[PDB]
């Protein structure tokens, strides 16, 4: 349910924030929240970007606008500032979700534990977040990934058949993956990416 990538790949800020604000609730689909540190990270960053955007939606109409306006505003401090920094981290939590969901949809699993999703959560964490966490934070995120629900309970919860659920996730993944990949491409192109750990 994300907007299709526009012809020119300039992602509009407001509709983006609106769409991705629907993602933290899925971490609540089993009742007690799952992967809470990932949820909290995404949520907190969305809030920070929306706060900058809301001050001047026309100035911050696109995500590229955020980066270029804040670069001008903040000089040498940029990109470790403002909505740019928040989106730098948001894209990592969003990529976590992308890789996790794609891995599940592709039937990736531990053949000895086919109803767990630990292999899929570990893979997603490795590709999206792990490089950017210190040892304390790694232990936090690690505990959450380990306490993942059963695969069957996860799929049930999103469907509140299993194959039909997976088809819907695959559909979602098309514009979702493209959008995230465009954000990553922009960060690299603008030299807005930082590698510091938390
Ligand atoms: C945890 C995010 C799930 C999103 C499914 C559409």
Q: Give the chain's end-to-end CA distance (angstroms, integer).
A: 31
- Which ligand 1 atom lies nearest to the CA of residue 34? 1
- 12 by DSSP, 3-state: which? strand
> Torsion angle, CA of 130/136/141/144, rounded to 10 degrees?
150
Residue 8: is it exposed, middle or buried by C-beta count within 10 angstroms (0-12/13-18/19+)? exposed
Q: Report CA(37)–ligand 1 centroid distance (Å).
A: 15
Distances (CA, A) of 151 to 47, 113, 117, 123: 30, 10, 6, 15
Is the separation of the CB atoms in 61 and 13 below 8 Å?
yes
Distance CA 110, CA 22 (A): 30
Resolution (angstroms) equals: 1.6
Please check whether residue 196 lies inside any domain of the structure: no
Distance CA 98, CA 174 (A): 10
CATH code of 14's domain: 1.10.3520.10
Please check whether residue 168 lies inside any domain of the structure: yes
Residue 190: is it exposed, middle or buried by C-beta count within 10 angstroms (0-12/13-18/19+)? middle
Mutating to test ligand 1, I would choose from 1, 20, 23 the residue with most ligand atoms within 8 A of its C-beta, which is: 23
Helices (H), ranges, 111-161: 118-128, 135-146, 151-158
User: Which residue from 59, 113, 112 is spatially nearest to 83, judged by alpha carbons?
Assistant: 59
Eight-state DSSP code of residue 190? T
Is the separation of the CB atoms in 34 and 24 below 8 Å?
no
β-bridge partners, 12: 62
Q: Report CA(15)–ligand 1 centroid distance (Å).
A: 18
- How big is the CA angle at 40 (ends 16 and 77), to the nearest 5 degrees? 70
Please check whether residue 180 lies inside any domain of the structure: yes
Please check whether residue 195 lies inside any domain of the structure: no
Q: Report CA(115)–ligand 1 centroid distance (Å).
A: 18
Helices (H), ranges, the chain: 13-20, 36-55, 63-74, 82-105, 118-128, 135-146, 151-158, 162-189
Which residues surround ligand 1 with Cβ inside 6 Å?
Answer: 23, 26-27, 97, 158, 169, 172
Q: How many CA atoms lie within 13 A of 51 on its CB side?
A: 11
Residue 79, preceding peptide bond in cis (omega within 30° of 0): yes
Our count of domains for the chain comes to 1
Binding residues, by number, are 41-48, 133, 196
Distance CA 68, CA 83 (A): 11
Q: Report which protein residue has its CA nearest ligand 1's atom 6.
A: 169
The experimental method behind these coordinates is X-ray
Enclosing domain of residue 30: 10-190
Residue with tokens 């949820």: 39
């Amino acid at each position: 349910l994300l907007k299709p990538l526009p012809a020119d790949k300039q992602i509009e800020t407001g509709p983006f924030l609106e769409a991705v604000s629907h993602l933290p609730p899925f971490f609540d689909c089993l009742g007690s929240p799952v992967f809470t540190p990932i949820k909290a990270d995404i949520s907190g960053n969305i809030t920070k970007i929306k706060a900058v955007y809301d001050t001047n939606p026309a100035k911050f109409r696109t995500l590229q606008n955020i980066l270029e306006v804040e670069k001008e505003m903040y000089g040498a401090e940029w990109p470790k500032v403002g909505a740019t920094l928040a989106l730098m981290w948001l894209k990592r939590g969003l990529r976590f979700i992308q890789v996790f969901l794609q891995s599940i949809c592709d039937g990736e699993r531990d053949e000895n534990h086919p109803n767990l999703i630990r292999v899929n959560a570990t893979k997603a964490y490795e590709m999206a977040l792990k490089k950017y966490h210190g040892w304390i934070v790694q232990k936090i995120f690690q505990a959450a990934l380990y306490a993942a629900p059963y695969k069957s309970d996860f799929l049930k919860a999103l469907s509140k058949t299993e194959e039909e659920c997976l088809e819907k996730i695959r559909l979602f993944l098309v514009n979702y993956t493209a959008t995230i990949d465009v954000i990553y491409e922009m960060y690299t192109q603008m030299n807005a990416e930082l590698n510091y750990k938390v």
